[PDB]
């Protein structure tokens, strides 16, 4: 048998726990970490690879209960690309059978938690000490209880407390969240209100019902409908690429209230469609976008990082949540295998570190490069609209259409399995 503990009740941690409990030879316990809010950033979305992992983990019922997808006949459109100056059409990116899929983060976490069998969740207590020696991990909690397991999963988010345990154990330098220099205004607009605002400037009503991204120099604005198209979610990005490589105040949360004036002034000089959209946003907030560096390793002994704890990224490819789900599916398939025991666990974790980390780190890198492309800063594309529109239609396929089962087949071959 295998005793597995998971620290962190986010999407990645609860998803892994739900699948790991389906195996009779595995005993799982799920513990809470520090709650988050400012770390949500631009939000949560699901690409084609994410929904595939969700189905592979058996979480389709919870996903259908809460996820938001664009109404027919635009169900497969990921985004339409437009110039921020005049809202002219540049192209579109299509995700067949998925399109633009998003969720309120708390809605999906709550839906997943309700499906947990009794006795798996051990909430209401926090880990105060974590030690390991000879293939076993010991965790001491605030209530005096101690949990000892063969494997401890660090799924506690971008400010993971367990990441320091992993980086120190491997002798690597510590890693804290890095401010990207990009801030994002967030808000929601009633769809009928936005239609009347667009019509007043002669803007097509098509731009309300289909997800849109308005591209400009050092900034971009995205919209997509939620709640059966009755509400339009808006994220307006502003990037400071000046000399300093900027920082965020150490005593400042990553989110604050924003004034309408400062938001409209930040997009002064943008087109009529973009400014009319921003004027519709009530009570806007501003979010300081952070990510994590590419870690040299995710494993130290019997402690392993997944999700944002291992590979927190910028949201420009909508790939953050999906990479944590790919971590959960990859690990649960190997751990759930009959041939998995405590004797080959170190071998199993080495396959995870050799096959999951290089892909996740590449997604971290490409997410930053994609943001540079959105804001007309790519060193080759620049503002070439023909090349920009063509590359935007294709540059996401390696992420969306990756077959994770080929990585698992390579892991088993390295383990001499099946």
UniProtKB/Swiss-Prot annotation:
Give the residues the record marks as binding FAD.
Answer: 3-32
EC code: 1.14.13.1
> What does the record give as cofactor?
FAD
Q: Sorted alphabetically, which Gene3D superfamilies does this protein's record hold?
A: FAD/NAD(P)-binding domain
Could you tell me which InterPro entries the record lists for this protein?
FAD-bd, FAD/NAD-bd_sf, FAD_monoxygenase, Salicylate_mOase
The pathway where this protein functions is:
Aromatic compound metabolism; naphthalene degradation
Please write the reaction equations for the catalytic activity of this protein: salicylate + NADH + O2 + 2 H(+) = catechol + CO2 + NAD(+) + H2O
**Quaternary organization:** Monomer.
Write the protein's name.
Answer: Salicylate hydroxylase
Species per Swiss-Prot/TrEMBL record: Pseudomonas putida (Arthrobacter siderocapsulatus)
* Name of the gene this protein is made from: nahG
